[PDB]
């Protein structure tokens, strides 16, 4: 072999896995990494576009490298948790709240 | 908005992607870049809260 006299152009194809959606999962799109749920889209990409953005550090759409499909990314549900208490001075009960 | 945009700066590290640093360097060498990024983001958060 020769040692980096040009951009890399010779190596394996890497194995792709079957596409799954509707449950938020990790993803890798040969340049995009992260976690989220993938849903069907309604926007229309230009033929040479790869992935869309909305604001800085916000990826809202990814093009399928297999079937040229547009998928929307939505983060997994999350939030803080709070406890309602009437005070241990009287009783011991809770009314946990998700936000 | 400014706060979110602050996340797109390298702060003098190799890159602003957290997983990329872990995916291309040894942990004992990546720790310093992680520390730089942590310091920068913490300072930005302090300024916003003030």
């Amino acid at each position: 072999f020769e040692l980096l006299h040009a951009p890399a152009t010779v190596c394996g194809p890497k194995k792709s896995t079957n596409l799954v959606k509707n449950k938020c999962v990790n993803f890798n799109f040969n340049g995009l990494t992260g976690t989220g749920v993938l849903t069907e889209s309604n926007k229309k990409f230009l033929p040479f576009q790869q992935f869309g953005r909305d604001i800085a550090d916000t990826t809202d759409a990814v093009r399928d490298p297999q079937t040229l499909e547009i998928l929307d990314i939505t983060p997994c549900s999350f939030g803080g948790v709070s406890v309602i208490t009437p005070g241990t001075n009287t009783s011991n009960q809770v009314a946990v709240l998700y936000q | 908005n400014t706060l979110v945009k602050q996340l797109s700066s390298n702060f003098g590290a190799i890159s602003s992607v957290l997983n990329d640093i872990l995916s291309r360097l040894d942990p004992p060498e990546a720790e310093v870049q992680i520390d730089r990024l942590i310091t920068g983001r913490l300072q930005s958060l302090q300024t916003y809260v003030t």
Partner: peptide, 30 residues
């Protein structure tokens, strides 16, 4: 259904307010 006076309706219409999803990327909440 939202019982308000006429001038209150004009006030509401004259002030114009996803960003929330962008925050949800980073844990910020409203």
């Amino acid at each position: 259904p939202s019982k308000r006076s006429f001038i209150e309706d004009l006030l509401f219409n004259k002030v114009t307010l996803d960003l929330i999803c962008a925050q949800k990327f980073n844990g910020l909440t409203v």
